[PDB]
Amino acid sequence: LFGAIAGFIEGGWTGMVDGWYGYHHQNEQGSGYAADLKSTQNAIDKITNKVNSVIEKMNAVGKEFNHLEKRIENLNKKVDDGFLDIWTYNAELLVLLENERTLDYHDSNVKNLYEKVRNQLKNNAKEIGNGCFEFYHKCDNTCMESVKNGTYDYPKYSEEAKLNR
Amino acid sequence: KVRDQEGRMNYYWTLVEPGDKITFEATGNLVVPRYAFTMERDAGSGIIISDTPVH
């Protein structure tokens, strides 16, 4: 557990519809939602592989006995019930563990996205605490495109952000 | 008496391989074959007990 999905980000965005994890900006040019497509694509590939691996791992009639073969009939019944119990247990356990692993995977993705944006903005922005940063400089759509790509220019706004800080 | 009969009939079967012969000798009490079944084997069949209709 990484404390992001139900942690410092306390709610999901129905507005976000282009991806699983993403970003919301509020410039002077307008508001918007925009998903992180690289993270979403990687997550989709990994989870598809997970489902396929669960599927690929899994892949009769009865016998009749007369009244003088009760021992062999009981042996057959024991074999059938034992295998049934083992396979039921395996299926339940696999689903239960895989679900937690998936949820933790999503939590890790969200937290890593937050970490990546933070290590890029540094002191030019302020952590509000709910999941967002308030920039100390007035930078436009090109700014948030750069932040999303990962090509933010800290020296470019370092001086401008210092007076407002 | 079951089915209004006091005597009995025991039923026997055998499998004769290709090139092999079967021989019946008697002085009484034999219910002889009339029809025999040439049989071919392939896996994937079975016997199920069901009251479900066939469509």
What are the C-alpha distances in Å from B22 to residues A75, A163, B9, B12? 36, 111, 21, 13
Cα–Cα distance, A122 to A133 (Å, whole number): 10
Top residue of A61, A63, A64, A65 to mutate, by most chain B CBs within 10 Å, is A61
Taking phi first (over 0 means left), then psi (-120 to 50 degrees means alpha), and beta for anything else, what does residue A138 get? beta
Distance CA A107, CA A113 (A): 10
DSSP conformation letters of A97-109: HHHHHHHHHHHHH
Other beta carbons within 10 Å of A22 = 20
Nearest 5°: phi and psi at B40?
-120, 140
Kindly state the DSSP code that residue A110 receives in the 8-state scheme: H
> Measured between beta carbons, which residues in chain A are less than 8 angstroms from residue B48?
61
Residues A134/A128, Cβ–Cβ less than 8 Å: yes
Nearest to A124 by CA among A97, A85, A160, A75: A160
Question: Residues of A88-123 as b/e, b for ≥16 C-beta within 10 angstroms?
Answer: eeeeeeeeeeeeeeeeeebbebbbebbeebeebbee
Please measure the distance between the N-terminal and C-terminal CA atoms of chain A and give it in whole angstroms. 34
Distance from CA of B53 to the nearest CA of A (A): 19
- In the numeric block, which tokens belong to residue A22? 């993403």
CA dihedral A89, A92, A95, A98 (to 10 degrees): -50
Question: At B39, which amino acid appears?
Answer: M
- Which tokens belong to A146? 């750069």
Give the rounded distance of the alpha carbon of A52 from its chain centre: 18
Residue B13 tokens read as 């079967």
Element (H, E) at A147: helix A141-149
DSSP string covering A44-96, please?
Answer: HHHHHHHHHHHHHHH--------TT-HHHHHHHHHHHHHHHHHHHHHHHHHHH
Element (DSSP H or E) covering residue A160: helix A154-164
Task: Give the gyration radius of chain A's Cα atoms.
Answer: 27
Which two structure tokens, joined as six digits, stand for A96? 């239960």
Q: How many residues does chain A have?
A: 165
- C-alpha distances out from residue B10 to A40, A156, B3, B13, Å: 74, 103, 15, 10
Round to whole Å and give the CA distance between B47 and A62: 8
Cβ-based interface (< 8 Å): residues of A facing B: 60-61
CA gap A125, A62 in Å, rounded: 71
Tokens at residue A59, please?
């892949």
Tell me, what DSSP letter sits at residue A34?
Answer: E
Contact indicator for A158, A124 with CB cutoff of 8 Å: yes
CB B30 within 8 A of CB B10: no
CB within 8 A of A15, min separation 6: which ones?
A: A24, A33
State the Cα–Cα distance between residues A19 and A26, nearest whole angstrom: 19
Which residue from A minimizes the CA distance to B47? A61
3-class secondary structure, A152: coil
